[PDB]
Amino acid sequence: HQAIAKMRTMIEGFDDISHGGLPIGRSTLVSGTSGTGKTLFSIQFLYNGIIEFDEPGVFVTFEETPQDIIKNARSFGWDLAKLVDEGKLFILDASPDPEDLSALIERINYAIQKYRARRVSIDSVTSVFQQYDASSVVRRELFRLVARLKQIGATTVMTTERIEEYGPIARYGVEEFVSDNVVILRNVLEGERRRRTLEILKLRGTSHMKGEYPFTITDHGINIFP
Amino acid sequence: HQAIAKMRTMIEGFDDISHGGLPIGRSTLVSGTSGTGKTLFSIQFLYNGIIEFDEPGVFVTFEETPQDIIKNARSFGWDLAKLVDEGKLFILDASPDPEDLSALIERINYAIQKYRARRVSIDSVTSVFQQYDASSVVRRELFRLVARLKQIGATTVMTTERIEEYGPIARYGVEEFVSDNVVILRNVLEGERRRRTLEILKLRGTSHMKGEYPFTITDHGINIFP
Amino acid sequence: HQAIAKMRTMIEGFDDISHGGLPIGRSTLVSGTSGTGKTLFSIQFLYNGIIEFDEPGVFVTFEETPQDIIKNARSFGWDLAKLVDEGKLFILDASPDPEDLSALIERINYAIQKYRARRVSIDSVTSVFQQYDASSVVRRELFRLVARLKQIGATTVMTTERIEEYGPIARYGVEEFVSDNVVILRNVLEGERRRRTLEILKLRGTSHMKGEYPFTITDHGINIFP
Amino acid sequence: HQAIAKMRTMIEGFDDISHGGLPIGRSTLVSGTSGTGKTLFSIQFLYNGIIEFDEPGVFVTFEETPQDIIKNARSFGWDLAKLVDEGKLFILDASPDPEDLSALIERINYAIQKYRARRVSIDSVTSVFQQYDASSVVRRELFRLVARLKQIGATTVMTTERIEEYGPIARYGVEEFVSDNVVILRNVLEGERRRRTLEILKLRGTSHMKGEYPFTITDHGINIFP
Amino acid sequence: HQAIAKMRTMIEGFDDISHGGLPIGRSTLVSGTSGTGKTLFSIQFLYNGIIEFDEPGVFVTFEETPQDIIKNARSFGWDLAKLVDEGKLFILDASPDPEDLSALIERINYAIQKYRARRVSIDSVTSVFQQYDASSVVRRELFRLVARLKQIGATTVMTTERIEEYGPIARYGVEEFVSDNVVILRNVLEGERRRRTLEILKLRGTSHMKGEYPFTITDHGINIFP
Amino acid sequence: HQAIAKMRTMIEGFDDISHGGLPIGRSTLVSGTSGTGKTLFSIQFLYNGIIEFDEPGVFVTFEETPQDIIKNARSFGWDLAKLVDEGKLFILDASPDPEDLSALIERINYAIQKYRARRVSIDSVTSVFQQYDASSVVRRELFRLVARLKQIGATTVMTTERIEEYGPIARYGVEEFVSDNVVILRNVLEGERRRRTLEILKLRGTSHMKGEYPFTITDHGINIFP
Ligand SMILES: Nc1ncnc2c1ncn2[C@@H]1O[C@H](COP(=O)(O)OP(=O)(O)OP(=O)(O)O)[C@@H](O)[C@H]1O
Ligand SMILES: Nc1ncnc2c1ncn2[C@@H]1O[C@H](COP(=O)(O)OP(=O)(O)OP(=O)(O)O)[C@@H](O)[C@H]1O
Ligand SMILES: Nc1ncnc2c1ncn2[C@@H]1O[C@H](COP(=O)(O)OP(=O)(O)OP(=O)(O)O)[C@@H](O)[C@H]1O
Ligand SMILES: Nc1ncnc2c1ncn2[C@@H]1O[C@H](COP(=O)(O)OP(=O)(O)OP(=O)(O)O)[C@@H](O)[C@H]1O
Ligand SMILES: Nc1ncnc2c1ncn2[C@@H]1O[C@H](COP(=O)(O)OP(=O)(O)OP(=O)(O)O)[C@@H](O)[C@H]1O
Ligand SMILES: Nc1ncnc2c1ncn2[C@@H]1O[C@H](COP(=O)(O)OP(=O)(O)OP(=O)(O)O)[C@@H](O)[C@H]1O
Ligand SMILES: [Mg+2]
Ligand SMILES: [Mg+2]
Ligand SMILES: [Mg+2]
Ligand SMILES: [Mg+2]
Ligand SMILES: [Mg+2]
Ligand SMILES: [Mg+2]
């Protein structure tokens, strides 16, 4: 009878195929090749949550400056600068200076406590994982991060990159099993045309729709057809 | 004339294709990609045994907290919290703290002696095996664990993860031969749709039905069509 | 005119496709994936020889206890316990304790001398070969073992495991050429059904039938259609 | 409403499929196998910019002498020697003598300051990256270079080589995600004929046309059909 | 006008597709998977030469005892024991004892001088090459052996083993280019049937027929259809 | 208007598909599997140049003795011995004795100065590159050699070997980009028949015909159909 509570991500059509959206408190992995729409997915999730439910979020990035994210959001019509100025949204800078996972998670926890945020998105933890070559270390650190996020209680959307359209759901192959949920974004080539597909392969402890559902990126956001 | 005794797992339709279910006292491997239904298979096996035959079980987990397992079971309608409180079911915690195989097998044996349990399920021994990179060490440790479980006399269902839908029956390729039985769970993609299949490739010392039999995961459990 | 003498293995239909069965005194390799019927093939060879020609055999195992082999044989109706008690069959234990190739071959020779056996079967020498990673060491040890078995004069059936259904005839790719004969057991999947095939690719110094011949495992043994 | 400003590259038909050309200030990756037209693409970009918008450019090369580039351009009818003499175009020599990324970026910045150039093209940074085998070092150095170029404010077109026509968008697989934009040049073989295709897979923060658009290299330049 | 002199191998039909047989004095490589007919090819070459042209030969073996070769030849009807006793044929033993390339080539040269032999066959030099893992060492040693054989003046048929039916013409991929000639023996599986094919891919300095020509192994020898 | 000057190679039909032949002064790579016709291509290029334009050439070889090259040429009807005796052609010996790139290039330069030769062919630089395993060292040495040859001013035809018919244009994958031009020789198998194809994938700074053009090796030379 009782089921895991879910929070609506307000993405057009995604809540229908997820049967209520992302579970509350669980860390959701999103994997896709370059140009699939991972960062846009996380940004749209955060912005829709902020606008609709008035729930502040914290966006963590490792390979983009906050100004670039603000410009990309302004391209769609999203004014993230106003949200950041008002304190309703916070963007964490962790990129290396062009000139320790404990520190990063401590900073994320401090941001959560200060801004009272209940949504978290990560641009890429693969950049952090590139420090350690061994897959055992990758699994250990990913599990530690997911456990810390579950203890904090924020709904995470960690996005990682994958090399092949069909095959491993990560660069290492271990990130598929550690994360509570995994969502696959595919950008395949068929007949000299690229068609975008969105598929959910697992949602632990709750039902979902299975298979590839096409989604088109428009000027307003991601439009998914259930 | 004489055959190996079998215990019914009470999974809908699985006993028909297994010709009596899992053999008694032998360790059964279950391999499947992410989202195939391995942990659900082991949990349903334990819970059906507990409810029907009143045989206590011990569930060993390495990547999930017991609370998460309880919530996932409650999603299906299974009240594992009551069973744990009554002492009829015990869940062993071996996950690393986010802050030696001899010890683990000793603890499992102690749990078996204390709770008088005759069924054992393992969430993932691959997490333990990730410590040792060499496949020889993996084979040695897996054989030691299987031999210890056979000496104890509990019916084990060890579940391990595999990378490719078609190919090795383990991440290493050695776990197919060491384990007494192997069961393959496949989640293939065909025509933008995912169809789940269940296949048994070997049951040493007893007959079985061979080939892919589709199984659908419903709110009550795993429904397999023989 | 003169040809290599052959001994009948009494397996249903195999003697027709082998043109007289295994050659006398030569070590025959049998390679197949998990669940193909390698151990059953060797056990049926030994038991049929013992029952028909009254020739004692020695079965060497590395990953199974003798009790498990006895139970598996009793499943088919073969009472190996009586044969072991009468001294007509001997099973050698070489598995590692869960708590040097010279020693193993010396023990096999001693068993041959004591029991006057003229048939030998090996469950898996791949378990021994896993100690040495280099393929040169594998080839050297395999050649030494085959030469020792030829000097002893017993008809060996060494069974090794292979990973892919189509491809190398061993985990290393060197065991195909060192062994005097090689027999391929295949368990392929086609249209969600598994069909078993038996093929002989070489029999040095004698003719044979070439190609895949289906064989079905029944409660009495292996039934092969020539 | 507001979008990222774009500068026209004046390549025939490319501005139609890019929806305004390359974004201003962002580093665009161009990946293609040998003989696809990467160096010709960068040279045509620079020369068209210089002729039309009177914007000086700086071409950085690592595997070709400036004389070879001048001869190749003269083949098409482009007189780069006059532009270099007049100071409107500068070619940077970084090739190893046949007899430190900080120095290279410092020299590029000095050239930008001296010649007041607002367009930059790179023949191959893969030659520099070949010094470091690890992909983490490649990602770090590529990100540092892209960040420095963004801080300078010049519109870069970095071209890197790829091995397979279908597969990774770089020799390492990491250069697809670090770069702000990626453009794929393909030279495929079908029916004993080679057909050239141009495809853009991502343009962060702006829309584009997706899919393979054939382009033919003529004596005047690259002719692309939108 | 002038061409490289050739010696007939007297194999049924092979001289037609080779346009005169193997060139005189050049070392011919023969590569094929297990069970293709490499050792039989070399033995038939030597025996046909001895019987027809009365030219003594020297057979060098590394993985078979001379007695096994004699028995295998007697299977076809070839009495190599009489030839060895009469001194018209010599078999060199180089296999490791089950209890330095300079020495081997010195022994081969001594055998050539003593028996006045003008034909040489090698069972497998891959067994020797397995000592050195690096492909550069393999190429160097193979070139040294071929140069020594050319200086001696004997017509060599070196046979090496290959793993895949389609792909490299050697286990290393370097033996295709060093050897003066290469002949490919294929044992492919198509529709559950094995069909044997013989193909010559290069004969330096002379013409040949190209493509796969089926050959069947009969009780008298190799029967090839040109 | 102005284009790169070209010299006719006088190969039947190749000048039509190359639009004037090889460029003057640039080093042309020729890659093909064993038995494709690389050495024959270089020898025919040199001999046709010598006979028609009276331009002396220098042939550099690493795996063949000059006598073998002379015999192979005499097979086609080419009397290279007379040319070598007259001093119109010089063959450089660099093969290792069966009993430093600076030295080799110095010797080639000395030969060019002594014989006033304006054409150079190389049998295989891959033999030299096998000393260094790393691909960075291979690229560096290949670039140094090509730069030295460009400074000398001789028209080079460097031939290297490739493993797969379809795939990398070299054993390492780096030789495709360093060389000024690359020509692919393919010997494919289709329907048990081998058909030879010649394709040019790039000619920097000049136009060419693209695609696979069949070429047949006859007793007089290479006959290519444009
Ligand atoms: N305003 C827009 N309208 C339409 N499509 C857009 C718009 N802005 C961006 N896109 C699309 O975004 C895609 C990729 O941008 P995005 O921000 O999603 O990167 P990404 O795939 O997450 O990147 P990475 O792989 O580097 O992490 C492009 O293919 C482009 O078509
Ligand atoms: N109540 C439910 N109704 C239907 N399907 C469910 C339900 N709960 C879970 N599932 C299914 O369970 C699948 C995976 O959950 P499960 O607990 O079996 O994980 P798993 O495959 O064992 O995980 P892992 O690979 O991480 O070990 C999902 O694809 C989802 O569809
Ligand atoms: N009594 C029986 N009747 C029918 N089939 C049986 C019987 N006993 C065993 N089998 C078959 O035996 C097969 C595998 O058992 P077997 O003893 O041959 O193992 P194996 O393939 O040699 O093992 P491994 O790969 O671990 O060495 C199973 O697929 C099962 O169908
Ligand atoms: N004048 C021309 N007319 C037509 N095609 C030309 C002309 N000049 C060059 N090309 C074409 O240029 C192609 C490759 O030259 P280019 O300068 O683009 O090299 P590239 O692909 O960038 O090189 P690399 O992979 O080494 O970096 C050739 O296939 C050739 O057909
Ligand atoms: N008398 C015979 N009649 C027919 N076929 C025979 C006869 N003797 C041997 N063969 C064939 O020889 C084949 C292999 O034997 P052979 O001596 O050619 O080995 P090989 O392929 O050279 O061995 P390896 O790969 O170990 O070097 C078998 O497939 C068998 O069919
Ligand atoms: N007189 C000839 N007539 C016809 N074909 C010939 C003649 N001489 C040689 N050949 C052909 O030459 C081909 C290979 O010889 P070639 O000298 O071209 O070697 P290659 O491919 O350059 O060698 P490698 O790969 O070892 O460098 C053979 O397939 C053969 O058919
Ligand atoms: Mg991103
Ligand atoms: Mg699990
Ligand atoms: Mg076995
Ligand atoms: Mg270039
Ligand atoms: Mg042999
Ligand atoms: Mg050559």
Short mmCIF file of C-alpha atoms and ligand atoms in Angstrom, two decimals, chain B residues 204, chain C residues 38-40 59 63-64 123-124 159 161, ligand 9:
data_model
loop_
_atom_site.label_atom_id
_atom_site.label_comp_id
_atom_site.label_asym_id
_atom_site.label_seq_id
_atom_site.Cartn_x
_atom_site.Cartn_y
_atom_site.Cartn_z
CA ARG B 204 23.72 -29.03 -11.62
CA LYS C 38 31.44 -31.03 -20.01
CA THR C 39 31.52 -32.65 -16.56
CA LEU C 40 28.53 -34.80 -17.50
CA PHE C 59 38.26 -38.87 -12.13
CA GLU C 63 36.18 -27.33 -7.97
CA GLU C 64 33.71 -29.98 -6.75
CA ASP C 123 37.05 -31.64 -14.30
CA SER C 124 39.02 -28.46 -15.00
CA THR C 159 37.69 -30.41 -19.92
CA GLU C 161 35.92 -23.70 -19.89
MG MG G 9 32.70 -29.31 -13.96
#
